[PDB]
From a paper:
SOCS2 is the substrate recruiting subunit of a CRL5 E3 complex that negatively regulates the JAK-STAT signaling by targeting substrate receptors for degradation and blocking STAT5b activation by competing with receptor pY sites. SOCS proteins share a conserved domain architecture comprising of an N-terminal extended SH2 subdomain (ESS) that functions as a bridge at the interface between the SH2 domain and the SOCS box enabling ubiquitination of captured substrate, followed by a central Src-homology 2 (SH2) domain that recognizes a phosphotyrosine (pY) containing sequence, and a C-terminal SOCS box that interacts with the adapter ElonginB-ElonginC complex (EloBC). SOCS proteins serve as substrate recognition modules that impart substrate specificity to each CRL5SOCS E3 complex. Here, we determine the co-crystal structures of SBC in complex with phosphorylated epitope peptides from its physiological targets GHR and EpoR.
The structure of SBC in complex with EpoR_pY426 peptide (SBC-EpoR) was solved and refined at 2.69 Å with 19.64% Rwork and 23.51% Rfree. Electron density for nine out of eleven non-terminal EpoR_pY426 residues are well defined in the structure. A classic SH2 domain-pY peptide interaction is observed, where the pY residue is anchored at the pY pocket and the flanking residues are extending across the SH2 domain. The pY residue is tightly locked by an intricate hydrogen-bonding network formed by residues Arg73, Ser75, Ser76, Thr83, and Arg96 of SOCS2. Additional hydrogen bonds are formed along the backbone of EpoR_pY426 peptide from Glu(−1) to Leu(+3) with SOCS2 residues Thr93, Asn94, Asp107 and one structural water. Upon binding of a substrate peptide, the EF loop opens up forming backbone interactions with GHR_pY595, or rearranges itself to allow a specific interaction with EpoR_pY426. This specific interaction between EF loop and EpoR_pY426 involves hydrophobic interactions between Ile109 and Val112 of SOCS2, Val112 of a SOCS2 symmetry mate, and Pro(+5) of EpoR_pY426, resulting in a differential binding mode between EpoR_pY426 and GHR_pY595 to SOCS2. The BG loop of SOCS2 is observed in an open conformation in the SBC-GHR2 structure whilst it is disordered in SBC-EpoR. The 1:1 binding mode for EpoR could be justified by the presence of Pro(+5) in EpoR, that acts as a strand breaker and prevents backbone to backbone interaction with the second peptide. Indeed, from the alanine scan, we observe that when Pro(+5) is replaced by alanine, the affinity improves—implying the possibility of secondary peptide binding.
Numbering used by the authors:
A (entry chain A): 30 to 136, 148 to 198
B (entry chain D): -3 to 5
C (entry chain C): 17 to 46, 57 to 112
D (entry chain B): 1 to 103
The structure:
Amino acid sequence: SMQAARLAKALRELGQTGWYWGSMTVNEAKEKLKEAPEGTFLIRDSSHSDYLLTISVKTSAGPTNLRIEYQDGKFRLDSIICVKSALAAFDSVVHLIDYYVQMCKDKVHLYLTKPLYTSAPSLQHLCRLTINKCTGAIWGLPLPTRLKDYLEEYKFQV
Amino acid sequence: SFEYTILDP
Amino acid sequence: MYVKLISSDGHEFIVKREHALTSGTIKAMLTNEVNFREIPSHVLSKVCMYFTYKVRYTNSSTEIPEFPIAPEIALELLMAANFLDC
Amino acid sequence: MDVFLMIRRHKTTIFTDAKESSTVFELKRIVEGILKRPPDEQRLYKDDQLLDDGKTLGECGFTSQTARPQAPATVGLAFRADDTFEALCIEPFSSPPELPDVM
């Protein structure tokens, strides 16, 4: 699989999340997260030419933004020039977000909790999220293979 | 810019 | 204005028409009364809860809350939601 | 702010909404347009306590912070047949099976 195909699969899952806000601006994200609980996040298109996506997250000090870099077919958080550039990188940007959400499941360092949905997602996708939080073994589930195929297209917990 | 963050030690 | 959704165990759920029209399957079979021979009441009740949750948070500017789904029902609810297309 | 309710009697269940400042009597008027029974033949309950038509839904304990769409509050309904009012009976829903080994 060449990089272009890998990036396309990563972008298709982004549209299946329900917290991808497209061409949202920096101030538009400030208002949707101004009163949200700490850790509430969303992902949107970066208005910068050197970046594809940007994480807008509500912190205790207020809403902020952190861009996502795409280099050598891997997504990673924006950090210093090579001082801390060997860090967590994944082929899927949803994987990158799910990785950091589960990391802060315990209780600067990024703190993500619950995403800010654009609209109410489908009941099918809501069940998939609840199932993904319980087990990762789709074969051991009493479901028709049509639904097992559905569970594989989105294996994340966020 | 002003409302953006980078990761730093 | 209202419709009647009957579960497999006989429970009658009276919903608003526009709320039940969230499901393309219910819309396809429309009337004023629809039976479901494979969806039990404890699942169909939750489905009706999703209808209200979906209509309320369709174009509203307020933050959408999480829809609670217990793991004991997620497998049955996933099969009913795929059958109803919602 | 609206209040989201489950009006339940026997095996019937009504999904409807009303404002927290609306009265119990106006809720019985909602039941009347659905089940064809005037409010004089209705007895609304929150759990076991009977609700007075004058009190608002807020005064009865149905606050907006609890009776949300994703989890509506249950209101028992009893009809009057002939001379007296029937006992409030709400048939329970079915029960989920045992989870698979993977969960």
